[PDB]
Design a protein around this nucleic acid. Structure first.
Ligand SMILES: [Mg+2]
Ligand SMILES: [Mg+2]
Ligand SMILES: [Mg+2]
Ligand SMILES: [Mg+2]
Ligand SMILES: [Mg+2]
Ligand SMILES: [Mg+2]
Ligand SMILES: [Mg+2]
Lengths: 118, 206, 62, 153, 262
RNA sequence: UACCUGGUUGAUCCUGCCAGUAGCAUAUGCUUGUCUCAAAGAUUAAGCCAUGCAUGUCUAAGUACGCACGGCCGGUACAGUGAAACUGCGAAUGGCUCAUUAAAUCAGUUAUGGUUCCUUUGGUCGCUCGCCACUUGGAUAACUGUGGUAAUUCUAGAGCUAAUACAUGCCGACGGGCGCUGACCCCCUUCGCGGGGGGGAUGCGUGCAUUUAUCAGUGGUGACUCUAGAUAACCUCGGGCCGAUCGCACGCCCCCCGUGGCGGCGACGACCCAUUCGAACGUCUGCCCUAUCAACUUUCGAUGGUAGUCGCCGUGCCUACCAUGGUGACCACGGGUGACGGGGAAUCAGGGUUCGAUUCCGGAGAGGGAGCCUGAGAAACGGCUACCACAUCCAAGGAAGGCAGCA
RNA sequence: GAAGCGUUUACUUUGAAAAAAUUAGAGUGUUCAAAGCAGGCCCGAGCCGCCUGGAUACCGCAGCUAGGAAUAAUGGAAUAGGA
RNA sequence: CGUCGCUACUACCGAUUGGAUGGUUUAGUGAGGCCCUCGGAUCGGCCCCGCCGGGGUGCCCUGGCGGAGCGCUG
């Protein structure tokens, strides 16, 4: 059972969960359902603990602080492109969009660009 | 939940009626707003048909009309002093449709001074000189004085009313329904209605 | 539900009393004369005549 | 007594009680205006409701009720409720099998405005249908007629 | 039920649709529109059962989706559009125009009209009021409302809507001596001249109408649709001229027709 | 087709029932060649259910950076087909059953001038003077990648990425007009006074909808406290509107020019009005058996009045204060019903007597109650929550149910 | 042509409004019939299509409308408070 | 014709504070939902005001790192 923020206990509680709270997605509009959840307090009674490195250490962890992976796809909104490349006004904002190339083995490789909105 | 249905009542003959269905939604009832006096808190509620109703949980300002002067101003609520339905409503200070309340007389006093150019709400005068001296005189022209003494000749206030103005508080009866509209609009008491409510206040205490 | 019709009627009426020699002989004479299969044919034509007479009686009283 | 007999203040909502009475109009108790309306359907508003002082929010003529639907008649039976009376409607129910009739009656709680001042038990009152005035009241008295009386010994 | 219905039974459909029992359990529940469903003729049955253009609902759907039907001058792709009384169904691809009018037996008849007659449509006003800014608004028996009408038009009078503009060309006052038509009840589909209107306050007023044969029939006011001034209709009347014949005369008319054809 | 016949006596006329006789409607027995229609787990058990299915959905016109395909014509935002997912809508209809229910449901009638109403259709959408607008902000799916649990249509952590999702928010029309506030100025009976009127500088509000109070009396009813006017104001930060939307052909103006301005046909979206589909509560009359049910109702609302609360609205619907009322042999109240109501069915001189679970209309229910979310519409059950009773899986920590839908 | 009846009803007649299905019943050779709501006509082949129907009746009691006024109930002027 | 004698059957009375199943209820406890008053695990904005670049010309246009106000707030 996943642990939900704000429970403030060790163990499990049953909670009535609405749309977009956590740990539950609704099968129809307005549906709520009582679900078992784990408290936010960490203890030994636990299987997997999710942790996020917010500060780097003096050394490099092997397989973690290396081989940087990109974001799978760049900005799509015109304003997002503008803030990504510091466009001011009409400086080829249309063609400044990142255009990703894709190379499949059994076909002629092609480069494709997403439609830009707004 | 709460039911507004007629079928849970005994019939006219006094016989017990048996229901033929369980409670429907359209015959629902919701908890009373119980409008207190204080900083504004309005809770929206979705009602039948997707419309919206306003629950005035707390109200500190109101819109009240003099009526006799046709002067409507946004004033503030002091406290509820009398309620015809329930005496407990007065002690718990809840605004309902017909309850009477004490309201500030400052905007009405200001309008009276600006229009009739006569002292009202003042005890003896010569205490607010930077403003009252200007507003009373204005050294205005011949025709402007001709239009001021024209409205002066019919400028009179009921004795029960200018005394309240001196006190700074006016008795006002609400006319809106807080908890249905989310407002506490009303009208200032005058004449026989004011006299009757004052006698009711005196009989209750005094 | 279904788009059936189930509108039907009996085309004959059985006699009130069975085993009358006169009625049995008269119906058998009709059957022999007109080659009828059984008593239901003579009963159905008798019922048709009775319905016609009933409608005519209603119109006559009208 | 007066018209102020309860914890609240009685007044006709459409009438402004205060008109800024000043010296241009003599303050010798100028009469407050009275709101009355014709209800139609050939019923004349009584002069008592025309010039009376009573306040009745359920009166057909001076109140906020509209007559529409069915107009019927009854005979006054009891007069023991505040501003409302019960009438009896006698009719005949036809029983087909015996080809005969059957006396049966229905009571009706109708609203009596104070304009009709001297109604007595047994007089015939015509009432008109209105919106539900109370739990069992759906009719309002429109006209009153005496039952072979008008002469009391 | 917990909400609005969206199904109609074949046997619960209006009788004048001439819907037979055996073909289907259901009926084409008309979509909401200008006219009530009890007195409207859906386009599907108009094109499938009245003109026999289509065989089934799919065929009539294809006709509708190819945008040939112009109800009231507007292309309507709804298969169950409520046509209603005195509406123009124009198929320009065939160059044919239909004015939906009740026949003698109180049911809509296929009424072919000329293109120069198909450009206007009479309407019976239903309510008159004044909206914001003191603007006179006028609604009709359809859901059609118009602004700035002639102040002479009162309730249950007639107006001439000019198509493609939605404006007024002329009007007919409702009074004695005006040719009209009954649009409901036992006398539905009968053409006559108003002779009397008796008033029952708080109740439905009743009018007495005399046709060309002199037969006098009464009806309610709400069922009266004036369609002409005096004794001359403003539109082409259907066959029979809205003259009701009892069973005997139509029987012998059938006999005469068969005898002349044979 | 308005019908009778046998049976008490030693015999006879009667009363009188028994039996016979005909239909139809459930079952059962025996038999059964053709063909057209056609009822069918209602009766006891609204008892319990394995399994499978019964509600999903895309046009040119909301959002494609899946290679999942594919035109690339090759220097380009976006060809196109498009899975998935977000968004919108539906899922409140239908189908089933008849347990409940006896002025209740329901049928005719009438009202809503006492209410709400998705959607369709028609109005209205520059009516408001008030350094992004050549277009603003943040997140989240789908997608890559790390998983947990025995398990489920369970989901967490990390990384992006869109809107007609969620917010934000101008310009324009816009020149002004109107009503108050009125510096002053001008013509006046002029004369030693008032003067009778005009312009007007500066500010305050201006539109629709909402909530008050007040004045007069464009259209409308049988009847408004109607609609429409006028004034003073308010106008709810989980806070009303005043288009930051989407496709199809592509064109016109060039003076100032030459880079901008104009443009048609639609779609979608709108506060409000009308219409359509309705819905909800009311009006009058109408229901089987029972007195071995005669007096009921009123502490705990029973009947009415006053003022509120709540509701979509009218009402004891509820609350507070009053009054003592209200219904009954013209059968109240209570009880029973092997009672869902009606259209209808059987029988067929006339009159009636029985039957209507059953395909149409209306009501109710989804094992029994109860409470809610979303939504225009549900007290929804092929939605959720809890209890009661049944009952499924389990690694014993948990998890999952509702065939009076078709089989 | 606008308004009232020199009472109020009961009763009778008329008209409106009364879902469909079912019932009676009109028409129509389903091969006859139960049914169904269809169908028929000339074609010498160009009939580049014509003629139709899908009625009507009943629908209680209660309510609405307009005629009649015999039967039955109901009342008007007796301390005249009469027209 | 009736008692008595035999045998079958059907209801009736009957200790058992007999039992069961419905329904309406008094009094008490009371799940859960909704509403109200709180609550604030967290997630954001401004004040940045510790640095640097700076700019009409340290008198910053600000673009970042970043102490952090240890405040005002959603
Ligand atoms: Mg876009
Ligand atoms: Mg039952
Ligand atoms: Mg039934
Ligand atoms: Mg049903
Ligand atoms: Mg919706
Ligand atoms: Mg239900
Ligand atoms: Mg449920």
């Amino acid at each position: 059972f996943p642990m939900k923020q704000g429970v403030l206990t060790h163990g499990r509680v049953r909670l009535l969960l609405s749309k977009g709270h956590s740990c539950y997605r609704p099968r129809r509009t307005g549906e709520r359902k009582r679900k078992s959840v784990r408290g936010c307090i960490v203890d030994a009674n636990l299987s997997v603990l999710n942790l996020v490195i917010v500060k780097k250490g003096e050394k490099d962890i092997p397989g973690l602080t290396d081989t940087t992976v990109p974001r799978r796809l760049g900005p799509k909104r015109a304003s997002r492109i503008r803030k990504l490349f510091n466009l001011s006004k009409e400086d080829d904002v249309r063609q400044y969009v990142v255009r990703k190339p894709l190379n499949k083995e059994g076909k002629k490789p092609r480069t494709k660009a997403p439609k830009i909105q707004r | 939940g709460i039911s507004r249905d007629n079928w849970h009542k005994r019939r006219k003959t006094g016989g017990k009626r048996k229901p033929y269905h369980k409670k429907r939604k359209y015959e629902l009832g919701r908890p009373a707003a119980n409008t207190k006096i204080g900083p504004r808190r309005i809770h929206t509620v979705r009602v039948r048909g997707g419309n919206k109703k306003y629950r005035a949980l707390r109200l500190d300002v109101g819109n009240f009309s003099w009526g006799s002067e046709c002067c409507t101003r946004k004033t503030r609520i002091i406290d509820v002093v009398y309620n015809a339905s329930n005496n407990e409503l007065v002690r718990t200070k809840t605004l309902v449709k017909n309850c009477i309340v004490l309201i500030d007389s400052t905007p009405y006093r200001q309008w009276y001074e600006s229009h009739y150019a006569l002292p009202l709400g003042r005890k003896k005068g010569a205490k607010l000189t930077p403003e009252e001296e200007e507003i009373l005189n204005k050294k205005r022209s011949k025709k402007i004085q001709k239009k001021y003494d024209e409205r002066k000749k019919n400028a009179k206030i009921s004795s029960l009313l200018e005394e309240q103005f001196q006190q700074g508080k006016l008795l006002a009866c609400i006319a809106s329904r807080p908890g249905q509209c989310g407002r506490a609009d009303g009208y200032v008491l005058e004449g026989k209605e004011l006299e009757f409510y004052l006698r009711k206040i005196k009989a209750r205490k005094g | 539900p279904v788009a059936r019709s189930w509108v039907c009627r009996k085309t004959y009426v059985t006699p009130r009393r069975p085993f009358e020699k006169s009625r049995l002989d008269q119906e058998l004479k009709l059957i022999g004369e007109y080659g009828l299969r059984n008593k239901r044919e003579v009963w159905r034509v008798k019922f048709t005549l009775a319905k016609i007479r009933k409608a005519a009686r209603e119109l006559l009283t009208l | 007594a007066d018209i102020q007999t309860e914890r609240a203040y009685q007044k006709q909502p459409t009438i402004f009680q205060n008109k800024k009475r000043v010296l241009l109009g003599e303050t010798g108790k100028e009469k407050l205006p009275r709101y009355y309306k014709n209800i139609g359907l050939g019923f004349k508003t009584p002069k008592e409701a025309i010039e009376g002082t009573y306040i009745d929010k359920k009166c057909p003529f001076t109140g906020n009720v509209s007559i529409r639907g069915r107009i019927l008649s009854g005979v006054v039976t009891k007069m023991k409720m505040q501003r409302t009376i019960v009438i009896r409607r006698d009719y005949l129910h036809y029983i087909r099998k015996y080809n005969r009739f059957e006396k049966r009656h229905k009571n009706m709680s109708v609203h009596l405005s104070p304009c009709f001042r001297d109604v007595q038990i047994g007089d015939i009152v015509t009432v008109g249908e209105c919106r539900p005035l109370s739990k069992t009241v759906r009719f309002n008295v429109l006209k009153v007629t005496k039952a072979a009386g008008t002469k009391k010994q | 039920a917990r909400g609005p219905k969206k199904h109609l039974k074949r046997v619960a459909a209006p009788k004048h649709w001439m819907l037979d029992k055996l073909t289907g359990v259901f009926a084409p529940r008309p979509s909401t529109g200008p006219h009530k469903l009890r007195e409207c003729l859906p386009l599907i049955i108009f094109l499938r059962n009245r003109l026999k253009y289509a065989l089934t609902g799919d065929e009539v759907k294809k006709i509708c989706m190819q945008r040939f039907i112009k109800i009231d001058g507007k292309v309507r792709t709804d298969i169950t559009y409520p046509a209603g009384f005195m509406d123009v169904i124009s198929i320009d691809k065939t160059g044919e125009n239909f004015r939906l009018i009740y026949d003698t037996k109180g049911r809509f008849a296929v009424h072919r009209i000329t293109p120069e007659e198909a450009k206007y449509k009479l309407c019976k006003v239903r309510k008159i009021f004044v909206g914001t800014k003191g603007i006179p608004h006028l609604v009709t028996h359809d859901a059609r409302t118009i602004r700035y009408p002639d102040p002479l038009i009162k309730v249950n009078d007639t107006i001439q809507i000019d198509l493609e503009t939605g404006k007024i060309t002329d009007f007919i006052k409702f009074d004695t001596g005006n040719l009209c038509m009954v649009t409901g009840g036992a006398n539905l589909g009968r053409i006559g001249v108003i002779t009397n209107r008796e008033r029952h306050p708080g109740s439905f007023d009743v009018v007495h109408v005399k046709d060309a044969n002199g037969n006098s029939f009464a009806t309610r006011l709400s069922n009266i649709f004036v369609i002409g001034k005096g004794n001359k209709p403003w539109i082409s009347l259907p066959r029979g001229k809205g003259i009701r014949l009892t069973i005997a005369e139509e029987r012998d008319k059938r006999l005469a027709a068969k005898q002349s054809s044979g």
